[PDB]
Every structure is written in structure tokens, then in C-alpha cells.
Request: fold
Amino acid sequence: CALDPLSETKCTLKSFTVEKGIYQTSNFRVQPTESIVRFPNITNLCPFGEVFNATRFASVYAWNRKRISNCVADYSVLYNSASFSTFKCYGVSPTKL
Amino acid sequence: FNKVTKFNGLTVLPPLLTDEMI
Amino acid sequence: SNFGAISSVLNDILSRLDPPEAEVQIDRLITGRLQSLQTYVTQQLIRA
Amino acid sequence: LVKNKCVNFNFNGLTGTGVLTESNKKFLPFQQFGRDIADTTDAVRDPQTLEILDITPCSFGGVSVITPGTNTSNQVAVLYQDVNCTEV
Ligand SMILES: *[C@@H]1O[C@H](CO)[C@@H](O[C@@H]2O[C@H](CO)[C@@H](O)[C@H](O)[C@H]2NC(C)=O)[C@H](O)[C@H]1NC(C)=O
Ligand SMILES: *[C@@H]1O[C@H](CO)[C@@H](O)[C@H](O)[C@H]1NC(C)=O
Ligand SMILES: *[C@@H]1O[C@H](CO)[C@@H](O)[C@H](O)[C@H]1NC(C)=O
Reply:
């Protein structure tokens, strides 16, 4: 079914004999050649330290809130460390972060 | 003719008889 | 149209979710698009 | 950045494939994307520099086979519909 274009016609017609005419078999695809990727060049490791290697955490009713932006982040180290009891993500694959 | 006035897997085939033949 | 899925583009589904749990969203999108195609084809047949 | 070829690109999470030609669409004083009737990212502004790249999808095409009855002969003529086959 993939040797020469007559064989595709034979496959599609589901017979060994094909009558005169035009027959549509498949589609033509152009394939991409490379994987160009562009990201902004600003590098500033946001400090996950004081949010993780902290000294004191607030109360439940007064939970601490922090904003995070402008990050060249690295979650590989976060996953690699086993010092944490539980690590569970919702809606995102942890390894694909 | 004067009074009488896309890229997601759909195509438009051209008619067999062009307007010249008609 | 989301059709109840979390995104209307399948690229986000493949590039965000883990493989083994993206099938639900992919199936919902497939069902919606298939139904739309069926309705369009039937309408075209009647008009033809 | 390389253009005029069918490339798989990635612009700050914008994922897709096509030809990223250089087009002077409009000002885009603060907007980044370029849309159309559908949810199509027609135009994109570069993340490093500031240029208006125009995205065009890769070529579609159906394949048909001209052939006489197989009783007569076995030669065939392939037809790629709506393909400006200067590039196979
Ligand atoms: C501060 O946090 C960093 C990472 O979040 C910790 O760094 C790692 O700590 C483990 C613990 O043994 C080491 O095995 C790794 O080699 C460390 N990695 C790096 C890049 O240093 C660090 O231990 C934390 N410090 C404190 C005081 O909690
Ligand atoms: C970094 O990005 C800025 C964005 O405006 C650009 O002006 C600059 O030339 C870039 N520099 C390098 C070394 O990539
Ligand atoms: C097909 O490609 C050639 C080479 O670029 C070009 O000259 C011609 O105009 C194209 N055909 C159409 C219909 O645009």
C-alpha cells in the first residue's frame, strides 16, 4: 500500500482492478524543518529562597501572599529535591512546568 | 457579471467548464 | 468552542497536561467537532 | 530567527508552524498579536526585537491519480491539487 501511486489507488478502490478515471487517494503535507524558539533575554532568578528557605510563616487566617513576575525560573531543582513531604499539581503536569 | 459581487483543512475545487467555454 | 474542555486549542492540551489525562479533553473536543461536521455535511446534502 | 521556510516556531508560548514572512501590516503601537475572523494568530511581534512577522500556514494539498483502465496499461499521472509545485 506504499510502493507506488498505482498501489494507493488499488488500496483505496479495495480491488485489484481499477477502471479509467481520476481517483483521490490521500493528502500532501509539507513538513517543518526546524524548531525556532525565541524568549526574552532578560535573566533574573526570582528568589524562591525566602519563600521556601524562610524563617516564619503566617497564620492560616492571615495567610502570606507574594507576587512573582519577570522570572527565568527553574522548577527542575524544586522537583529533584525530596525534602518535601507532598507535591501535587492541579491542571499542569509537574514535569512539564 | 458586473452586477454580481480558509486555511484549516478546507479547499475549493475549480469548475471543469471555465466561463469561456460557457 | 470549548465544548466543556479547558481550552479551545489542542496544542495547549498536549503541551500543558500529562499524556494519560489529556484524553478526556481531547475526546470532548473531538465529539464537538465531529457533531459540527455532521450537521454541516447534512445541510450541504439537502442544499445540493 | 529564520524566515521564508516552513518552520515550527515558539514565540513566548505561541506555538505553531508555518512561514514567518516579513510584512508591514500596520503600526501595532502596543499590541503584539494579529488576529483574523477565526482564532488565528495571523501576525506576531518578535520578543527580542520589534518586527511584524506574518504567519502563513504550510501548503495543503490533495493527491489524485490519472490512470487509464488497468486492463490497458499501468502508467499513471499524479496531480497535486492547488500546489504551486516549484517545491515538490
Ligand atoms: C535553600 O534552598 C536551596 C534550594 O531551594 C537549597 O539548596 C539545595 O539544598 C540541598 C539540601 O541538601 C542540597 O543537597 C543541594 O545541593 C542544594 N542546592 C544548591 C544549588 O545549593 C538549600 O539547601 C536551602 N538552604 C537552606 C538553609 O534551607
Ligand atoms: C536583549 O533584548 C533587548 C530587548 O529590547 C534588546 O534590545 C537587546 O539588544 C538584547 N540583547 C542581547 C544581547 O540579546
Ligand atoms: C507560483 O510560483 C511562482 C514562483 O514563485 C510564481 O511566479 C507564480 O506567480 C506562482 N503562482 C501564482 C498563481 O501565484
Q: What stands out?
A: The pocket of 2-acetamido-2-deoxy-beta-D-glucopyranose (ligand 3) is lined by residues D 84, 86 (CB under 6 Å). Chain B touches chain D through five residues (CB under 8 Å). DSSP finds no helices and no strands in chain B.
